[PDB]
Coordinates of C-alpha atoms and ligand atoms in Angstrom, one line a residue:
Chain K
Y1 CA -0.2 0.1 0.2
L2 CA 3.0 2.5 0.7
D3 CA 3.4 2.0 -3.1
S4 CA 0.8 3.9 -5.0
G5 CA 2.2 3.4 -8.5
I6 CA 1.4 -0.4 -8.5
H7 CA -1.8 -2.4 -7.4
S8 CA -2.6 -5.8 -7.1
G9 CA -5.5 -7.9 -8.2
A10 CA -7.5 -7.4 -4.6
Chain O
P1 CA 1.9 5.7 -74.3
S2 CA 5.5 4.3 -75.9
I3 CA 8.8 6.4 -76.6
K4 CA 11.6 5.3 -78.5
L5 CA 14.9 4.9 -77.0
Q6 CA 18.1 5.2 -79.5
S7 CA 21.2 3.7 -78.4
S8 CA 24.6 4.9 -79.2
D9 CA 24.7 2.4 -82.2
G10 CA 21.5 3.3 -83.3
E11 CA 19.3 0.3 -82.8
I12 CA 15.8 1.7 -81.4
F13 CA 13.6 0.5 -78.6
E14 CA 10.4 0.7 -78.1
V15 CA 9.6 1.3 -74.4
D16 CA 6.6 2.0 -72.0
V17 CA 6.8 5.6 -71.2
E18 CA 6.4 5.2 -67.0
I19 CA 9.6 2.3 -66.9
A20 CA 11.7 4.8 -69.3
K21 CA 10.9 7.4 -67.0
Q22 CA 13.0 5.9 -64.0
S23 CA 16.2 7.5 -65.5
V24 CA 15.5 11.1 -64.4
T25 CA 17.9 12.3 -67.3
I26 CA 15.7 10.3 -70.1
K27 CA 12.4 11.8 -68.2
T28 CA 14.1 15.5 -68.5
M29 CA 14.8 14.8 -72.1
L30 CA 10.9 13.8 -72.7
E31 CA 9.4 16.6 -70.5
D32 CA 11.7 19.6 -70.6
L33 CA 13.0 19.4 -74.1
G34 CA 10.3 17.7 -75.7
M35 CA 12.5 15.0 -77.8
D36 CA 11.4 12.1 -79.4
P37 CA 13.0 10.0 -79.9
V38 CA 15.9 10.1 -77.4
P39 CA 19.2 9.8 -78.3
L40 CA 21.5 8.0 -75.9
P41 CA 25.0 8.6 -77.2
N42 CA 26.5 7.2 -74.1
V43 CA 25.0 3.6 -74.0
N44 CA 25.1 1.0 -76.6
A45 CA 22.7 -1.3 -77.4
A46 CA 23.9 -4.2 -75.6
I47 CA 24.3 -2.4 -72.7
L48 CA 20.8 -0.7 -73.1
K49 CA 18.8 -3.8 -73.2
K50 CA 20.4 -4.9 -69.9
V51 CA 19.2 -1.8 -68.4
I52 CA 15.6 -1.9 -69.6
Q53 CA 15.3 -5.3 -68.4
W54 CA 16.3 -4.4 -65.0
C55 CA 14.3 -1.1 -65.0
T56 CA 10.9 -3.6 -66.0
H57 CA 11.8 -5.7 -63.1
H58 CA 11.6 -3.1 -60.7
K59 CA 8.8 -0.8 -61.7
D60 CA 18.7 -3.7 -50.5
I61 CA 19.7 -5.8 -53.3
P62 CA 17.2 -8.6 -54.0
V63 CA 18.3 -12.2 -55.3
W64 CA 16.9 -11.5 -59.1
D65 CA 19.3 -8.8 -59.1
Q66 CA 22.3 -10.8 -58.2
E67 CA 21.5 -13.3 -61.0
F68 CA 21.1 -10.4 -62.9
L69 CA 24.6 -9.1 -62.2
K70 CA 26.4 -12.2 -63.0
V71 CA 28.4 -10.7 -65.6
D72 CA 32.0 -9.9 -66.0
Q73 CA 33.5 -6.8 -64.7
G74 CA 34.0 -5.1 -67.8
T75 CA 30.3 -5.2 -68.6
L76 CA 29.4 -4.5 -64.7
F77 CA 31.6 -1.3 -65.4
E78 CA 29.5 -0.5 -68.2
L79 CA 26.6 -0.7 -66.5
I80 CA 27.8 1.7 -63.7
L81 CA 28.5 4.3 -66.5
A82 CA 25.4 3.9 -67.9
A83 CA 23.3 4.1 -64.6
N84 CA 25.5 7.3 -64.1
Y85 CA 24.7 8.6 -67.3
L86 CA 20.9 7.8 -67.1
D87 CA 20.7 8.9 -63.4
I88 CA 19.1 5.5 -62.4
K89 CA 19.9 5.7 -58.6
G90 CA 18.7 2.2 -57.8
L91 CA 21.0 0.9 -60.4
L92 CA 23.7 2.5 -59.6
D93 CA 23.4 1.5 -56.1
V94 CA 23.3 -2.1 -56.6
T95 CA 26.3 -2.1 -59.0
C96 CA 28.4 -0.1 -56.4
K97 CA 27.2 -2.1 -53.5
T98 CA 28.3 -5.0 -55.7
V99 CA 31.7 -3.7 -56.4
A100 CA 32.2 -2.9 -52.6
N101 CA 31.3 -6.6 -51.6
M102 CA 34.0 -7.9 -54.1
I103 CA 36.4 -5.7 -51.8
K104 CA 35.1 -6.3 -48.2
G105 CA 36.9 -9.0 -46.3
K106 CA 40.0 -9.4 -48.5
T107 CA 43.7 -8.8 -47.6
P108 CA 45.3 -5.9 -50.0
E109 CA 46.8 -9.0 -52.0
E110 CA 43.8 -10.9 -52.7
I111 CA 41.8 -7.5 -53.5
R112 CA 44.7 -7.0 -56.4
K113 CA 44.2 -10.5 -57.7
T114 CA 40.5 -9.8 -57.7
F115 CA 40.6 -6.9 -60.0
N116 CA 44.1 -7.5 -61.9
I117 CA 45.6 -4.6 -59.9
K118 CA 49.5 -4.4 -59.8
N119 CA 51.3 -3.0 -56.4
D120 CA 52.8 0.1 -57.2
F121 CA 54.3 1.1 -53.7
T122 CA 57.6 1.6 -53.1
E123 CA 58.3 -0.8 -50.1
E124 CA 59.0 2.6 -47.9
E125 CA 55.6 3.8 -49.1
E126 CA 54.0 0.7 -47.9
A127 CA 55.2 0.3 -44.8
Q128 CA 54.5 4.0 -44.0
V129 CA 50.8 3.3 -44.8
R130 CA 50.6 0.3 -43.0
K131 CA 52.5 1.3 -39.8
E132 CA 49.4 3.7 -39.8
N133 CA 46.9 1.0 -39.3
Chain E
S1 CA 33.6 -7.4 -72.7
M2 CA 36.8 -6.7 -70.6
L3 CA 37.3 -9.7 -68.1
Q4 CA 38.8 -7.6 -65.4
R5 CA 38.6 -3.6 -64.5
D6 CA 40.0 -1.5 -61.8
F7 CA 37.0 0.4 -60.7
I8 CA 38.8 2.4 -58.4
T9 CA 41.2 3.5 -60.6
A10 CA 38.9 3.6 -63.9
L11 CA 36.1 5.9 -62.2
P12 CA 38.3 8.7 -61.0
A13 CA 40.2 8.7 -64.8
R14 CA 36.6 9.4 -66.5
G15 CA 36.2 12.3 -63.9
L16 CA 33.5 10.0 -61.6
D17 CA 35.4 10.4 -58.8
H18 CA 32.4 10.2 -56.4
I19 CA 31.2 7.1 -57.8
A20 CA 34.5 5.4 -56.6
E21 CA 34.2 7.0 -53.2
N22 CA 30.7 5.9 -53.0
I23 CA 31.7 2.3 -53.8
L24 CA 34.6 2.6 -50.8
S25 CA 32.1 4.2 -48.5
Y26 CA 30.4 0.5 -48.1
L27 CA 33.5 -0.6 -46.7
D28 CA 33.7 -1.7 -43.2
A29 CA 36.8 -0.3 -41.4
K30 CA 39.1 -3.2 -41.8
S31 CA 37.9 -3.6 -45.5
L32 CA 38.6 0.5 -45.9
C33 CA 42.3 -0.1 -44.5
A34 CA 42.8 -2.9 -47.2
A35 CA 41.9 -0.7 -49.7
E36 CA 44.0 1.8 -48.9
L37 CA 46.7 -0.9 -49.1
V38 CA 45.7 -1.9 -52.6
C39 CA 47.8 0.7 -54.7
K40 CA 48.7 4.2 -54.3
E41 CA 45.6 5.4 -56.8
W42 CA 43.2 3.4 -54.1
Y43 CA 45.1 5.3 -51.4
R44 CA 44.5 8.6 -53.1
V45 CA 40.7 8.0 -53.8
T46 CA 40.4 7.1 -50.0
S47 CA 42.2 10.2 -48.8
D48 CA 41.1 12.7 -50.9
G49 CA 37.7 11.5 -50.7
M50 CA 37.8 11.8 -46.8
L51 CA 36.4 8.2 -46.5
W52 CA 37.7 7.7 -43.0
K53 CA 35.5 10.9 -42.1
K54 CA 32.6 9.7 -44.0
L55 CA 33.1 6.5 -42.3
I56 CA 32.6 8.1 -38.6
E57 CA 30.0 10.4 -39.9
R58 CA 28.0 7.2 -41.2
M59 CA 28.2 5.6 -37.7
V60 CA 27.0 8.6 -35.9
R61 CA 24.2 8.9 -38.3
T62 CA 23.4 5.1 -37.8
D63 CA 24.6 4.4 -34.2
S64 CA 23.4 6.3 -31.1
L65 CA 26.7 5.0 -29.3
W66 CA 29.0 6.6 -31.8
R67 CA 26.6 9.9 -31.7
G68 CA 26.7 10.1 -28.0
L69 CA 30.4 9.4 -28.1
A70 CA 30.8 12.4 -30.7
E71 CA 28.7 14.8 -28.4
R72 CA 30.3 13.8 -25.2
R73 CA 34.2 13.4 -26.2
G74 CA 33.9 16.6 -28.4
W75 CA 35.4 15.0 -31.5
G76 CA 31.8 15.6 -32.9
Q77 CA 32.9 19.2 -33.5
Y78 CA 34.8 18.2 -36.5
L79 CA 32.0 16.4 -38.5
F80 CA 29.6 17.7 -41.1
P81 CA 41.4 18.6 -40.4
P82 CA 42.7 16.3 -42.8
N83 CA 42.1 12.7 -44.0
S84 CA 44.6 11.3 -41.5
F85 CA 43.3 13.1 -38.5
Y86 CA 40.2 10.8 -38.8
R87 CA 42.1 7.6 -39.8
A88 CA 44.0 8.0 -36.4
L89 CA 40.7 8.8 -34.5
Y90 CA 38.8 5.5 -35.6
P91 CA 40.8 3.3 -33.3
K92 CA 40.6 5.5 -30.4
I93 CA 36.7 5.4 -30.9
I94 CA 36.9 1.7 -30.9
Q95 CA 39.2 1.3 -28.0
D96 CA 36.5 4.2 -26.1
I97 CA 33.6 1.8 -27.0
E98 CA 35.6 -1.3 -25.7
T99 CA 36.1 0.4 -22.3
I100 CA 32.4 1.4 -21.8
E101 CA 31.3 -2.3 -22.6
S102 CA 34.1 -3.6 -20.2
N103 CA 32.4 -1.1 -17.6
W104 CA 29.2 -2.2 -18.2
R105 CA 30.1 -5.7 -18.0
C106 CA 32.1 -5.1 -14.7
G107 CA 30.1 -2.6 -13.1
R108 CA 32.5 0.0 -13.2
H109 CA 31.0 3.5 -12.9
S110 CA 31.1 6.9 -11.4
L111 CA 27.9 7.8 -9.3
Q112 CA 25.8 11.2 -8.8
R113 CA 23.4 11.1 -5.8
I114 CA 20.2 13.9 -5.6
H115 CA 18.5 14.0 -2.6
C116 CA 15.4 15.5 -3.3
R117 CA 14.8 16.6 0.3
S118 CA 11.1 15.9 0.4
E119 CA 9.7 17.5 3.5
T120 CA 7.1 15.0 4.2
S121 CA 6.1 12.1 1.9
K122 CA 9.3 10.6 0.6
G123 CA 9.9 9.0 -2.5
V124 CA 10.3 9.4 -6.2
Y125 CA 7.9 7.6 -8.3
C126 CA 8.7 8.9 -11.8
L127 CA 11.5 10.0 -14.1
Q128 CA 12.6 11.0 -17.4
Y129 CA 15.6 12.5 -18.6
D130 CA 18.0 14.2 -21.4
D131 CA 21.3 15.8 -21.7
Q132 CA 19.9 19.1 -20.3
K133 CA 17.4 17.9 -17.3
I134 CA 15.7 15.4 -15.3
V135 CA 12.3 15.5 -14.5
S136 CA 10.9 13.8 -11.8
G137 CA 7.7 13.1 -10.2
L138 CA 7.5 13.0 -6.1
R139 CA 5.1 11.3 -3.7
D140 CA 5.0 14.7 -2.0
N141 CA 2.7 15.6 -5.0
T142 CA 5.2 17.8 -7.0
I143 CA 7.3 17.6 -10.0
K144 CA 10.9 18.5 -9.8
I145 CA 13.0 19.4 -12.3
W146 CA 16.8 18.9 -11.8
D147 CA 19.8 20.0 -14.1
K148 CA 21.3 17.3 -15.6
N149 CA 25.0 19.0 -14.9
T150 CA 24.7 20.8 -11.5
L151 CA 22.2 18.4 -10.1
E152 CA 20.3 21.7 -8.7
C153 CA 16.5 21.9 -8.5
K154 CA 15.2 24.6 -11.3
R155 CA 11.6 24.2 -11.0
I156 CA 9.0 22.6 -8.6
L157 CA 5.7 22.4 -10.0
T158 CA 2.8 22.0 -8.2
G159 CA -1.3 21.1 -8.8
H160 CA -1.8 17.6 -8.3
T161 CA -3.2 16.7 -4.9
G162 CA -1.5 13.3 -4.7
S163 CA 1.5 11.8 -5.6
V164 CA 2.9 11.9 -9.4
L165 CA 2.6 8.4 -10.2
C166 CA 3.8 8.6 -13.8
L167 CA 5.0 11.4 -16.2
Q168 CA 6.3 11.8 -19.7
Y169 CA 7.5 14.8 -21.5
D170 CA 8.3 15.8 -25.3
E171 CA 10.1 19.0 -26.5
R172 CA 6.9 21.1 -25.5
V173 CA 5.0 19.6 -22.9
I174 CA 5.1 17.2 -19.6
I175 CA 2.3 15.1 -18.8
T176 CA 1.7 13.5 -15.6
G177 CA -0.6 11.3 -13.9
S178 CA -1.5 11.2 -10.4
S179 CA -3.0 9.3 -7.4
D180 CA -5.6 12.3 -7.5
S181 CA -6.7 10.6 -10.4
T182 CA -6.3 13.3 -13.0
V183 CA -3.7 13.8 -15.9
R184 CA -2.2 17.2 -16.3
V185 CA -0.4 18.9 -18.8
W186 CA 2.7 21.2 -18.2
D187 CA 4.5 23.3 -20.5
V188 CA 7.8 21.8 -20.7
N189 CA 9.6 25.2 -20.9
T190 CA 7.8 27.6 -18.3
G191 CA 6.1 24.9 -16.0
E192 CA 2.7 26.2 -16.4
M193 CA -0.4 24.1 -16.1
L194 CA -1.9 24.2 -19.7
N195 CA -4.6 21.3 -19.3
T196 CA -6.1 18.8 -16.7
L197 CA -8.1 15.6 -17.6
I198 CA -11.0 14.9 -15.3
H199 CA -12.0 10.8 -16.2
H200 CA -10.2 8.2 -14.5
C201 CA -11.8 6.7 -11.4
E202 CA -8.9 6.0 -9.4
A203 CA -5.0 6.8 -9.6
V204 CA -3.3 7.2 -13.0
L205 CA -0.9 4.8 -12.6
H206 CA 1.0 5.2 -16.0
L207 CA 0.8 6.6 -19.4
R208 CA 2.5 7.3 -22.7
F209 CA 2.0 9.7 -25.6
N210 CA 3.7 10.0 -29.0
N211 CA 2.7 11.7 -32.5
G212 CA -0.5 13.2 -31.2
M213 CA -2.1 10.5 -29.2
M214 CA -1.8 9.5 -25.7
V215 CA -2.9 6.3 -23.8
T216 CA -3.6 6.1 -20.2
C217 CA -4.4 3.9 -17.7
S218 CA -5.5 3.6 -13.9
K219 CA -6.4 1.8 -10.8
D220 CA -9.8 1.8 -11.7
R221 CA -9.3 -1.2 -14.4
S222 CA -9.4 1.1 -17.7
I223 CA -7.5 2.1 -20.4
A224 CA -8.1 5.6 -22.3
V225 CA -7.0 6.5 -25.7
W226 CA -6.9 10.5 -26.2
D227 CA -6.4 12.3 -29.5
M228 CA -4.3 15.8 -28.6
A229 CA -4.6 18.1 -31.4
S230 CA -3.0 20.5 -28.8
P231 CA -1.9 20.9 -25.4
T232 CA -5.5 22.4 -24.8
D233 CA -7.3 20.2 -27.1
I234 CA -7.5 16.7 -25.8
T235 CA -10.6 14.4 -27.0
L236 CA -11.4 10.7 -25.4
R237 CA -11.2 8.8 -28.6
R238 CA -12.3 5.2 -26.7
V239 CA -12.3 3.8 -23.6
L240 CA -10.6 0.0 -23.1
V241 CA -12.0 -2.3 -20.6
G242 CA -11.3 -5.8 -19.6
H243 CA -8.7 -6.2 -17.4
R244 CA -9.7 -7.3 -14.1
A245 CA -7.5 -5.6 -11.7
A246 CA -5.9 -1.9 -12.0
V247 CA -3.8 -1.7 -15.0
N248 CA 0.0 -0.8 -13.8
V249 CA 1.3 0.1 -17.2
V250 CA 0.7 0.7 -20.9
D251 CA 3.0 1.4 -23.6
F252 CA 1.9 1.6 -27.5
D253 CA 3.5 2.3 -31.0
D254 CA 1.6 2.5 -34.4
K255 CA 0.8 -1.3 -34.5
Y256 CA -0.4 -1.8 -30.9
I257 CA -1.3 -0.7 -27.6
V258 CA 0.0 -3.0 -24.9
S259 CA -1.3 -3.0 -21.0
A260 CA -0.4 -4.8 -18.1
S261 CA -2.2 -5.4 -14.8
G262 CA -2.6 -6.7 -11.3
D263 CA -4.7 -9.5 -12.9
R264 CA -1.5 -11.3 -13.8
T265 CA -1.9 -10.3 -18.0
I266 CA -0.7 -8.6 -20.6
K267 CA -3.4 -7.2 -23.4
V268 CA -2.6 -6.2 -26.8
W269 CA -4.8 -3.7 -29.1
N270 CA -5.2 -2.7 -32.2
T271 CA -3.7 1.0 -32.1
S272 CA -5.8 2.3 -35.0
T273 CA -9.2 0.5 -34.0
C274 CA -9.2 -0.1 -30.4
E275 CA -10.2 -3.6 -30.6
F276 CA -8.7 -6.5 -28.3
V277 CA -5.9 -8.5 -29.9
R278 CA -4.5 -11.0 -27.6
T279 CA -3.6 -11.6 -24.1
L280 CA 0.0 -12.6 -23.4
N281 CA -0.3 -14.9 -20.3
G282 CA 2.1 -16.5 -18.2
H283 CA 3.3 -14.5 -15.2
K284 CA 2.2 -16.1 -12.3
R285 CA 1.4 -12.9 -10.2
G286 CA 0.6 -9.3 -11.3
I287 CA 2.7 -7.1 -13.7
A288 CA 4.4 -4.3 -12.0
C289 CA 6.2 -2.9 -15.4
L290 CA 6.8 -3.3 -19.0
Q291 CA 8.1 -1.9 -22.3
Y292 CA 7.4 -2.5 -25.8
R293 CA 9.1 -2.0 -28.9
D294 CA 8.9 -3.3 -32.4
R295 CA 7.9 -6.9 -31.6
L296 CA 9.5 -7.2 -28.1
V297 CA 7.6 -7.1 -25.1
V298 CA 9.9 -7.3 -21.8
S299 CA 7.5 -7.3 -18.4
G300 CA 8.7 -7.6 -14.8
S301 CA 6.2 -9.3 -12.0
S302 CA 5.6 -9.4 -8.5
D303 CA 6.7 -13.1 -9.3
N304 CA 10.1 -11.9 -9.1
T305 CA 10.7 -12.6 -12.7
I306 CA 11.2 -10.9 -16.0
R307 CA 9.7 -12.0 -19.2
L308 CA 10.4 -11.5 -22.7
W309 CA 7.6 -11.7 -25.2
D310 CA 6.9 -11.4 -28.9
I311 CA 3.8 -9.3 -29.8
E312 CA 2.9 -11.2 -32.9
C313 CA 2.6 -14.6 -31.9
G314 CA 2.5 -14.0 -27.9
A315 CA 5.3 -16.4 -27.3
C316 CA 7.4 -16.0 -24.1
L317 CA 11.0 -16.2 -25.2
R318 CA 12.7 -16.4 -22.1
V319 CA 12.0 -16.1 -18.6
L320 CA 14.5 -14.5 -16.5
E321 CA 15.2 -14.9 -12.8
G322 CA 17.5 -13.5 -10.3
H323 CA 15.8 -10.8 -8.8
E324 CA 15.0 -11.5 -5.3
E325 CA 12.0 -8.9 -4.8
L326 CA 9.1 -7.5 -6.9
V327 CA 10.4 -6.4 -10.2
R328 CA 9.2 -2.8 -10.1
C329 CA 10.4 -0.9 -13.2
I330 CA 12.0 -2.1 -16.4
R331 CA 13.7 -0.8 -19.4
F332 CA 15.9 -2.1 -22.7
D333 CA 17.7 -0.9 -25.7
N334 CA 19.4 -2.6 -28.4
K335 CA 21.9 -4.5 -26.1
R336 CA 20.5 -4.7 -22.6
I337 CA 17.5 -5.0 -20.1
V338 CA 17.8 -2.8 -16.9
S339 CA 15.5 -3.9 -14.1
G340 CA 15.0 -2.5 -10.6
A341 CA 13.5 -4.1 -7.4
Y342 CA 11.8 -3.7 -4.5
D343 CA 15.0 -4.4 -2.6
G344 CA 16.6 -1.6 -4.0
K345 CA 18.8 -3.9 -6.2
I346 CA 19.5 -2.9 -10.1
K347 CA 20.3 -5.8 -12.3
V348 CA 21.7 -5.8 -15.9
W349 CA 20.7 -8.3 -18.5
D350 CA 22.3 -9.3 -22.1
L351 CA 19.4 -8.8 -23.8
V352 CA 21.2 -10.5 -27.0
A353 CA 22.0 -13.3 -24.8
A354 CA 18.4 -13.7 -23.4
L355 CA 16.6 -13.6 -27.0
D356 CA 19.1 -16.7 -28.1
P357 CA 17.6 -19.7 -26.3
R358 CA 20.9 -21.5 -26.6
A359 CA 22.5 -19.3 -23.9
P360 CA 22.2 -20.6 -20.4
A361 CA 20.2 -18.8 -17.7
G362 CA 23.1 -18.2 -15.5
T363 CA 25.0 -16.3 -18.1
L364 CA 22.3 -13.4 -18.6
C365 CA 22.4 -11.3 -15.8
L366 CA 25.7 -9.5 -16.2
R367 CA 25.6 -7.3 -13.2
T368 CA 23.8 -6.7 -10.1
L369 CA 23.8 -3.0 -8.9
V370 CA 23.3 -2.0 -5.3
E371 CA 23.3 1.7 -4.4
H372 CA 19.6 2.4 -3.4
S373 CA 18.2 1.9 -0.1
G374 CA 14.6 1.7 -1.0
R375 CA 12.3 0.3 -3.8
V376 CA 13.1 1.0 -7.0
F377 CA 10.3 2.4 -8.8
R378 CA 11.7 4.1 -12.2
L379 CA 14.8 3.9 -14.3
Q380 CA 15.9 5.0 -17.8
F381 CA 18.9 4.4 -19.6
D382 CA 21.3 4.9 -22.5
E383 CA 24.5 3.6 -23.8
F384 CA 26.3 5.5 -21.3
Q385 CA 24.2 5.8 -18.0
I386 CA 21.4 4.6 -15.8
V387 CA 19.0 7.1 -13.9
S388 CA 17.2 5.8 -11.4
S389 CA 14.8 6.9 -8.3
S390 CA 13.7 5.1 -5.4
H391 CA 11.7 5.0 -2.5
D392 CA 14.3 6.3 -0.5
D393 CA 13.9 9.7 -2.0
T394 CA 17.3 9.6 -4.1
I395 CA 17.7 10.0 -7.8
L396 CA 21.1 8.5 -9.0
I397 CA 22.9 8.8 -11.9
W398 CA 25.2 5.8 -12.8
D399 CA 27.7 6.7 -15.2
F400 CA 29.9 3.7 -17.1
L401 CA 32.1 6.5 -19.0
Ligands
LIG501 O1 -3.8 -15.2 -4.7 C1 -2.1 -15.3 -4.7 O2 -1.6 -16.5 -5.4 C2 -1.5 -14.3 -4.2 C3 -0.4 -14.4 -3.1 C4 0.1 -13.3 -2.4 C5 0.2 -12.1 -3.1 C6 -0.1 -12.2 -4.5 N1 0.2 -10.8 -5.4 C7 0.8 -9.6 -5.0 O3 1.7 -9.6 -3.9 C8 1.3 -8.5 -6.0 C9 1.2 -7.1 -5.8 O4 1.7 -6.7 -4.6 C10 1.5 -5.5 -4.3 C11 2.8 -4.3 -4.1 C12 2.4 -3.3 -4.0 C13 1.0 -2.6 -3.9 C14 0.1 -3.8 -4.0 C15 0.3 -5.0 -4.1 C16 1.4 -6.5 -6.7 C17 1.0 -6.6 -8.1 C18 1.4 -5.7 -9.0 F1 2.4 -6.0 -9.9 F2 0.4 -6.3 -10.4 F3 1.4 -4.4 -8.9 N2 1.0 -8.0 -8.3 C19 0.5 -9.1 -7.2 O5 0.5 -9.9 -7.6 C20 -1.0 -13.2 -4.8

């Protein structure tokens, strides 16, 4: 969550 | 339309206007000087037929051209000259590239043998040219 | 007619020196050296023809490495001084290339370190650079432009209300995407905000633009395709939907748009029509980063691997193992892949070797470079250097010349 640049499939 | 090309010998060739005009030189003689037929004092019939054949096929050196260029060096030289005189950039380029391919990857002695060139360096001069490589 | 003919002597004899010069201009260096020693007239043609000057110029025209060196080393000033100067210069350029290639293989470099001095929320999510400047997007909501030579900050651009996650610029504008879900357009010279695109429902995670069009992608799981008639006239052309999670990256050219997602997929779209073409499947977790050019896609994943793909058939050509954490950024040129990971490490990969299925895997990673103290978010490189940025709030310039 600290990395706002990428996101999982959640 | 058809345009008559006139070789240095005098033999006349009937050629389609759009292929003939691949030579900017011959195109200029038609479009700007309005000449018919087109005299070609610097290209004989034998070389002219060879160039016309090349221009039709070509209405970056492919396989068909390589077979077309399996000729002696004297004819290739005449072909370079015709392509220059007619200013057919495509033909001048493939013929010049063909000569470069006959030069590349050879020692000076093997190059001499390819083109029948005598070595005219002094011993001293050759060593100097060699020292600088 | 004649069996043999000395083209290089015969052509100048008839006043056609340029044809003889053009023939020799096709020679590689070693064959040009050979031509010099064929006979006195051949030497004269190469020398009076300035063939060594023409050879260096063709390289600068045909090789960004030679172009870059001409500029950096200063001998480019002489291009476009006798023939012998260029003949003696040519081996020095070769040796220079050799030392650069050795420095890459062995990791010998100098290092510049920019401390971004972020007051609150530390970290640099994105960056692009040229010879004049580094433009960087920061978790503190700003874009900072740094002077490439003095490393000082020349401009802070404010206006986003969340982190600056992605950016690209050209000769006229900077375009940025943000956690605040907007895309913004800035004047690259003055920094003035020129336009804001309100469209995405969630963070704008990546964008690319070129030749009047832009693609943007978002945590909202969609891709937007834009037509930019001007900085102030940007129209939505199409929305591509189909990803089942955030789309983390998008790249494109005239053939295809390429998107990759937390949903473990890469998707390929037709640029002209915006129709779905194919999914490149295979990574076992989400894809964090990607670069696409020609037929090659290279992607980096939470599964700690890098995959190389052919765009036309969708085949995976090579799996690159070695990173110990999530592969977070990736770039590639003609000779190398450069990747950054969540553990702060950067790896250099031999791209030619990687695309040759005979090469063993252990020979593929040339080096591991360890100078960041946090996640590596973005990098960009060329023949001479890497510029990288990190959660640790630094920008590094790695210089192999
Ligand atoms: O169900 C399973 O087998 C399973 C089990 C454990 C972990 C996961 N997956 C991930 O941890 C993950 C990412 O972690 C994050 C890192 C930072 C912020 C948010 C998530 C990021 C990506 C991305 F590359 F797409 F961004 N993908 C992923 O897959 C999947």
